[PDB]
Amino acid sequence: STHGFYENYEPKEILGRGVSSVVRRCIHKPTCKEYAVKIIDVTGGGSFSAEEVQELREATLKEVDILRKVSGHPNIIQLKDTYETNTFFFLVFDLMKKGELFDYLTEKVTLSEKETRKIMRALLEVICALHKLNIVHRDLKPENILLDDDMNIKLTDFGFSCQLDPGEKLRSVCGTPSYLAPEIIECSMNDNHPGYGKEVDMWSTGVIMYTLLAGSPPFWHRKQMLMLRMIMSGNYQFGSPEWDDYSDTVKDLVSRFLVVQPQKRYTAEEALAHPFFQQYV
Numbered sequence: 001s002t003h004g005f006y007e008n009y010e011p012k013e014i015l016g017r018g019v020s021s022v023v024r025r026c027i028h029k030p031t032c033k034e035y036a037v038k039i040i041d042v043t044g045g046g047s048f049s050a051e052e053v054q055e056l057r058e059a060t061l062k063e064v065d066i067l068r069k070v071s072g073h074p075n076i077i078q079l080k081d082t083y084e085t086n087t088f089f090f091l092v093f094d095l096m097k098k099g100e101l102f103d104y105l106t107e108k109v110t111l112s113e114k115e116t117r118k119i120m121r122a123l124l125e126v127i128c129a130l131h132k133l134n135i136v137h138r139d140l141k142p143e144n145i146l147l148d149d150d151m152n153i154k155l156t157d158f159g160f161s162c163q164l165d166p167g168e169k170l171r172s173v174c175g176t177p178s179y180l181a182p183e184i185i186e187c188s189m190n191d192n193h194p195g196y197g198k199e200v201d202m203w204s205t206g207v208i209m210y211t212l213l214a215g216s217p218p219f220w221h222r223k224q225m226l227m228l229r230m231i232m233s234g235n236y237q238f239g240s241p242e243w244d245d246y247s248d249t250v251k252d253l254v255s256r257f258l259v260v261q262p263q264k265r266y267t268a269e270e271a272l273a274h275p276f277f278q279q280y281v
């Protein structure tokens with residue numbers, strides 16, 4: 001499969017990395033077309049522990065299977081090819097040439113209300129289609145939303161995703177602590193807690209919507225545990241110079257993702273019916 005991979009593609013420059021991966025631009029030899037390959041080291045560079053190797057191999061098998069499930073959506077990355085050797089996995093994808101939403105937010109500082117509107121509608125439609133399949137992404141954040149050549153977003157990174165059976169609940173904690181829903185944190189501090197569902201994605205959506213308009217996240221503290229209490233209490237504001245220029249309509253939408261009790265939180269469908277997206281009914 002390594003021969004298979006290097007037999008069919010010429011590897012190019014690094015585009016990004018993760019704890020146990022490297023993503024590169026690569027050229028398909030037969031077509032001369034360009035792709036992005038995510039290279040996952042299941043061994044972890046000679047340092048994990050046999051058990052973990054099989055936790056990482058079944059992790060990426062879960063990832064590939066979630067990707068085959070969501071294929072075809074216009075705003076979701078397309079897995080085009082996969083190769084598997086004893087240590088490495090190779091996921092071949094369409095090449096997103098305008099990088100991350102993160103990188104784009106870094107250079108613009110903040111995004112206007114109309115640009116945020118366009119991005120958020122595209123993401124909510126994505127999330128809506130995931131949730132109908134009962135898929136929870138669990139890593140929604142600006143680094144995992146990419147931009148193609150016309151600046152339309154492409155949801156990517158399904159490495160923590162899962163399909164749920166009817167009424168099932170999750171318990172493991174994964175994802176970036178600034179984007180983590182409260183019920184996840186709660187769950188990590190109580191064995192008796194019910195577990196969390198699809199709604200964690202609607203919290204993250206809230207932190208992303210907020211952050212594109214403010215240029216900074218709604219819940220931060222240099223000391224993690226105090227940041228987590230802020231999140232668990234849902235203690236944030238539309239403040240200082242930061243929110244002065246925006247409508248009341250956007251802020252109302254945001255505050256409806258940013259609700260602690262999951263039951264009371266907006267769903268992807270509720271968010272698309274808000275007045276904020278109804279200008280042209």
Ligand SMILES: Nc1ncnc2c1ncn2[C@@H]1O[C@H](COP(=O)(O)OP(=O)(O)OP(=O)(O)O)[C@@H](O)[C@H]1O
Pocket residue numbers: 015016017018019020021023036038077093094095096097099100143144146156157158159
């Ligand atoms: N299809 C792609 N087109 C262009 N660049 C990409 C593509 N896929 C990934 N990259 C880049 O590589 C980075 C890492 O990709 P990905 O999120 O899929 O890796 P990961 O190891 O799962 O990351 P994480 O630490 O968030 O778990 C992305 O955030 C992006 O910069």
Ligand SMILES: [Mn+2]
Pocket residue numbers: 018143144157
């Ligand atoms: Mn990622």
Ligand SMILES: [Mn+2]
Pocket residue numbers: 018139157158159160
């Ligand atoms: Mn990931």
